[PDB]
């Protein structure tokens, strides 16, 4: 629980699912990222109870909650700050000009946090490269893990929602809603696709409806230039038919410093 008294708001960041974001120092000092989460857009006393155990996930590659503001509305969540923001248009910026190995260290940081929400037993639901921020070090984290739970628009929690994460989401989650670990390790295939694609759009020729039914008959994202062979059986090893048949991250990791060493 953070004294409110001890936030300064300095400028915003954008908008996300829960209303603006804003950068601001926390006492005086540190760098922060501040939700403020727009009234009627979150189930609210879900999220607070439920706060610490996301408040223990703690891990290099993810981004940190360092509290909340639960005693007011609109309620605060301060977390970590990430200096270049978002992933998806880092990798659309032609300037950063990026080598191979930097694109497979960007998969390698979020592989990292993954891996570790995976042995807490923990879904992010939404992970993608919009999901995903870049800091001072051009170091990427995944970013709010586990807060599609609380969002309360239905074309957000919908399958068939305008907003709902068609492009990221395997055949059982679109058909079924069977989300498990295999169901984030699919939109981790879509995600190293978006990093190797420099932030194409998944399925770029086709709409939701279209994806859903492509993925429904066997077939995939075709290989991004910039990605190798064995990158790509690393990507294409996440979208497996069978759930039961994909990669666990560990795996994944295991893969991706292989391909490191190699090429
Ligand atoms: C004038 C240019 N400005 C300065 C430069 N630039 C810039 C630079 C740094 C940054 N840095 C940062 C931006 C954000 C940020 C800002 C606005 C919205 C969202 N966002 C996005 C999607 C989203 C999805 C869900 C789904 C699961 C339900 C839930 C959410 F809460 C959100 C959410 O809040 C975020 C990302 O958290 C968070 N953090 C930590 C940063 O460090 N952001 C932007 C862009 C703006």
Same mark, same amino acid.
């Given at each position: 629980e953070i004294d409110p008294k001890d936030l300064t708001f300095l400028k915003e960041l954008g908008t996300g699912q829960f209303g603006v974001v804003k950068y601001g120092k926390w006492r005086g000092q540190y760098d922060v990222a501040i939700k403020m989460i727009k009234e009627g857009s979150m189930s609210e006393d879900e999220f607070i109870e439920e706060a610490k155990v996301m408040m223990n996930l703690? *891990? =290099?590659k993810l981004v940190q909650l360092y509290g909340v503001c639960t005693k007011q509305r609109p309620i605060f969540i301060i977390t970590e700050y990430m200096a270049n923001g978002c992933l998806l248009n880092y990798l659309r910026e032609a300037r950063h000009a990026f080598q191979t190995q930097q694109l497979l260290e960007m998969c390698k940081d979020v592989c990292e946090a993954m891996e570790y929400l995976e042995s807490k037993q923990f879904? *992010?639901?939404?992970?993608?490269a919009r999901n995903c921020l870049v800091n001072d070090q051009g170091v990427v984290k995944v970013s709010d893990f586990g807060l599609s739970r609380y969002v309360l628009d239905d074309e957000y929690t919908?399958?068939?929602?305008?907003?709902?994460p068609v492009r990221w989401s395997p055949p059982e989650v679109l058909?079924?809603?069977?989300?498990?670990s295999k169901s984030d390790i699919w939109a981790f295939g879509v995600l190293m696709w978006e990093i190797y694609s420099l932030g194409k759009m998944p399925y =770029?020729?086709?709409?939701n409806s279209e994806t859903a039914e492509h993925i429904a008959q066997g077939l995939r994202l075709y290989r991004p230039h910039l990605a190798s062979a064995a990158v790509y059986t690393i990507m294409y090893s996440?979208? *497996? =038919?069978?759930?039961?048949e994909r990669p666990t991250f560990k795996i994944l990791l295991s893969n991706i410093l292989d391909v490191m060493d190699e090429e």
């Open positions: 703690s *891990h =290099e879904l *992010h639901r939404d992970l993608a919908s399958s068939v929602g305008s907003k709902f058909m079924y809603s069977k989300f498990s =770029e020729r086709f709409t996440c979208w *497996h =038919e069978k759930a039961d």
